[PDB]
Amino acid sequence: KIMLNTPEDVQALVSGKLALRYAGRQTEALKCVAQASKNRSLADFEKALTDYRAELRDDPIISTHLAKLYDNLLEQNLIRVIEPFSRVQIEHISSLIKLSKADVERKLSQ
Amino acid sequence: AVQKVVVHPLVLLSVVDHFNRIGKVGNQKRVVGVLLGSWQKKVLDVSNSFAVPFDEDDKDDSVWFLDHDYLENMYGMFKKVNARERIVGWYHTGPKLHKNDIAINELMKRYCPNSVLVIIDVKPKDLGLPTEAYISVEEVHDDGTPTSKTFEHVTSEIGAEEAEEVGVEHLLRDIKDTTVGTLSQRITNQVHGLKGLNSKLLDIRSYLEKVATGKLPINHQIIYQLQDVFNLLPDVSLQEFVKAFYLKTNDQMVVVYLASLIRSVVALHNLINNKIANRDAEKKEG
Amino acid sequence: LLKLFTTMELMRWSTLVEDYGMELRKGSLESPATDVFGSTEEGEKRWKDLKNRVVEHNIRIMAKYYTRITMKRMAQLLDLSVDESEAFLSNLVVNKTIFAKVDRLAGIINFQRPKDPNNLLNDWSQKLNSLMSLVNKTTHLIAKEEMIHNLQ
Amino acid sequence: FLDTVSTFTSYELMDYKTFVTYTVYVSMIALERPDLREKVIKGAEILEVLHSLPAVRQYLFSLYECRYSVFFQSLAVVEQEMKKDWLFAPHYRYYVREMRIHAYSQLLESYRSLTLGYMAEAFGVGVEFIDQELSRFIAAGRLHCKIDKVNEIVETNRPDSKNWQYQETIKKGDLLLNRVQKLSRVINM
């Protein structure tokens, strides 16, 4: 349900008393994924992939799908800021996301 | 009000009749004919017309002779046989616009609705379009001159609806149709320079004459727009249009490949039959 | 209202500062200006988004003209920082600024000079210019030729 | 090799793992990124047979990922394994050069200008070798336009689309011109 970009129903499923008793460390990372999706943030999603990687290390094959969501929001940001900029500095446009130009350059050129 | 008009050649051939029924008397003045048409729709469509005995004076220009009973009788009988067409205006065959035309047109401005004026030539030597629609409307002038009747040029086209095209095409048997291709294009591309050369050359001479030798204000205000539009193309350096010459020249290359390749395909049947027919007819002739 | 109607000349808002101040001071007309500023944050949003709205609207007016106002100099004449002008560009990316040209080396922007396809753009301009010269040349030529007939 | 779904272990000519090991060269080199993404990456066959040997997954994800630092360190296994084969040895010279120029066209396709620092760090080799590499691939390879070293930076233009896309037919125009000259030679005899 988070693959279809709807965090409001995620809040509706973590706010109900029925599924609240089965909550734990597993659903916290999903709350950070839904928070990064509703906030349209990228470095926060990398923080969710950094602090919770010790419950994201035992993650199933769907990790490729989560990386497809990360690269999908990255694609939205790239088509968001680059599209109005015909020719601009790489640090003036990468300073907004405060990320390195290595992964961004590799994904772009790819 | 009216953007364009449609004039059928029937009325101009009725001017050929105006030049036929003269009778060799020696007058050949600007015979005024009663123009008919369809003023209902926004576009004007002349179907047919008739004439009225019109005679002027030699010295005095303000003399003009019309007829109301003949107009109401010819228009009454013509409306009785065909009520789909009504009076619209008139037209004179004189090449020059005289001052009395405001009084001649004023009668059909009072009795009839707003009449359109058409100036043609007595001799069909003019290469340009003989029909010019001049609307009779009063316009406000910026210089402060009193409001008077002004003849503004309305664009005109010579077309036939159903039958006159067939009759003209059968009576001529010399004119050609559209016939897109080599001849109809290259004739226009050859004589077009004379089609603009006689017009511009015929106009700018009397224009330059009336520049220095002119008085009685000729509306010099429009000359500023004239030379302005003439100076709206200040010999462009063609710097930006180079890539456009690369595009049109690339289409030229496309026509080169189409001509060479397609003609090379046409050479098949010729350059095969030339051998297989000649050698077999030769070896089987005897 | 006449200044906000059309053709907004680039003027300083300091002349409007005292106009709004006396707009709050005088009670003969438009009295509830203190009611406009009733809330602590609503009036501040109306004022900041008001000056922002006119400082974007004048950009939308001068964007029609291709005069190349050189917004680097415009930022100097407006006496404001370029960072909130970049934020103004963040308002332009949602204000449909997709038809523009920026520069990596300099800071001058271009609202025109596209790829310019000669089959569409120069085709259109040459059509209107050449054809307009043809028919406009056609009207007053024979029209004046009829105007000179009255001299006889 | 698209019918590999119905293929099976054929002890008569070649084992299935040898058929995959032999088709991974023609598929890995003879195909571009859209051809791989359409044929093999979308297909589950290589996803099934990649678990047999972990090297092939490295030579596919490293090549598709454009990581030369590990592809050149692990390329020695492709060099030694490429030879000493019955039918695959005498062609070992073509796969190496063709794969190198294919990778250089892959990286150089999306890149207009390239500094020597990011290139030397990306490929993990000295500049003295890529100097003669690109120097030999300008005339010998014929991959892109002329290269310049006025700033010691790989900078190409590649005007191969706008005018050259129309100029791709001038070769058939000249050869067809000599062929219609032959057509003129058939005349009268």
Swiss-Prot record, chain A:
<feature type="domain" description="PCI">
    <location>
        <begin position="1"/>
        <end position="110"/>
    </location>
</feature>
<comment type="function">
    <text>Component of the 26S proteasome, a multiprotein complex involved in the ATP-dependent degradation of ubiquitinated proteins. This complex plays a key role in the maintenance of protein homeostasis by removing misfolded or damaged proteins, which could impair cellular functions, and by removing proteins whose functions are no longer required. Therefore, the proteasome participates in numerous cellular processes, including cell cycle progression, apoptosis, or DNA damage repair. In the complex, PSMD11 is required for proteasome assembly.</text>
</comment>
<protein>
    <recommendedName>
        <fullName>26S proteasome non-ATPase regulatory subunit 11</fullName>
    </recommendedName>
</protein>
<feature type="cross-link" description="Glycyl lysine isopeptide (Lys-Gly) (interchain with G-Cter in SUMO2)">
    <location>
        <position position="17"/>
    </location>
</feature>
<comment type="similarity">
    <text>Belongs to the proteasome subunit S9 family.</text>
</comment>
<comment type="subunit">
    <text>Component of the 19S proteasome regulatory particle complex. The 26S proteasome consists of a 20S core particle (CP) and two 19S regulatory subunits (RP). The regulatory particle is made of a lid composed of 9 subunits including PSMD11, a base containing 6 ATPases and few additional components.</text>
</comment>
From Swiss-Prot, chain B:
<dbReference type="GO" id="GO:0000502">
    <property type="term" value="C:proteasome complex"/>
</dbReference>
<dbReference type="InterPro" id="IPR024969">
    <property type="entry name" value="EIF3F/CSN6-like_C"/>
</dbReference>
<comment type="similarity">
    <text>Belongs to the peptidase M67A family.</text>
</comment>
<dbReference type="GO" id="GO:0005634">
    <property type="term" value="C:nucleus"/>
</dbReference>
<comment type="subunit">
    <text>Component of the 19S proteasome regulatory particle complex. The 26S proteasome consists of a 20S core particle (CP) and two 19S regulatory subunits (RP). The regulatory particle is made of a lid composed of 9 subunits including PSMD7, a base containing 6 ATPases and few additional components. Within the complex, PSMD7 interacts with subunit PSMD4 through their respective MPN domain. Interacts with TRIM5.</text>
</comment>
<feature type="modified residue" description="N6-acetyllysine">
    <location>
        <position position="210"/>
    </location>
</feature>
<dbReference type="GO" id="GO:0042803">
    <property type="term" value="F:protein homodimerization activity"/>
</dbReference>
<dbReference type="GO" id="GO:0016020">
    <property type="term" value="C:membrane"/>
</dbReference>
<dbReference type="GO" id="GO:0070062">
    <property type="term" value="C:extracellular exosome"/>
</dbReference>
<protein>
    <recommendedName>
        <fullName>26S proteasome non-ATPase regulatory subunit 7</fullName>
    </recommendedName>
</protein>
<dbReference type="GO" id="GO:0005829">
    <property type="term" value="C:cytosol"/>
</dbReference>
<feature type="domain" description="MPN">
    <location>
        <begin position="5"/>
        <end position="140"/>
    </location>
</feature>
From Swiss-Prot, chain C:
<protein>
    <recommendedName>
        <fullName>26S proteasome non-ATPase regulatory subunit 12</fullName>
    </recommendedName>
</protein>
<feature type="modified residue" description="N6-acetyllysine">
    <location>
        <position position="64"/>
    </location>
</feature>
<feature type="domain" description="PCI">
    <location>
        <begin position="1"/>
        <end position="116"/>
    </location>
</feature>
<comment type="subunit">
    <text>Component of the 19S proteasome regulatory particle complex. The 26S proteasome consists of a 20S core particle (CP) and two 19S regulatory subunits (RP). The regulatory particle is made of a lid composed of 9 subunits including PSMD12, a base containing 6 ATPases and few additional components. Interacts with ERCC6.</text>
</comment>
<comment type="similarity">
    <text>Belongs to the proteasome subunit p55 family.</text>
</comment>
<comment type="function">
    <text>Component of the 26S proteasome, a multiprotein complex involved in the ATP-dependent degradation of ubiquitinated proteins. This complex plays a key role in the maintenance of protein homeostasis by removing misfolded or damaged proteins, which could impair cellular functions, and by removing proteins whose functions are no longer required. Therefore, the proteasome participates in numerous cellular processes, including cell cycle progression, apoptosis, or DNA damage repair.</text>
</comment>
From Swiss-Prot, chain D:
<feature type="domain" description="PCI">
    <location>
        <begin position="1"/>
        <end position="161"/>
    </location>
</feature>
<protein>
    <recommendedName>
        <fullName>26S proteasome non-ATPase regulatory subunit 6</fullName>
    </recommendedName>
</protein>
<comment type="function">
    <text>Component of the 26S proteasome, a multiprotein complex involved in the ATP-dependent degradation of ubiquitinated proteins. This complex plays a key role in the maintenance of protein homeostasis by removing misfolded or damaged proteins, which could impair cellular functions, and by removing proteins whose functions are no longer required. Therefore, the proteasome participates in numerous cellular processes, including cell cycle progression, apoptosis, or DNA damage repair.</text>
</comment>
<comment type="similarity">
    <text>Belongs to the proteasome subunit S10 family.</text>
</comment>
<comment type="subunit">
    <text>Component of the 19S proteasome regulatory particle complex. The 26S proteasome consists of a 20S core particle (CP) and two 19S regulatory subunits (RP). The regulatory particle is made of a lid composed of 9 subunits including PSMD6, a base containing 6 ATPases and few additional components.</text>
</comment>
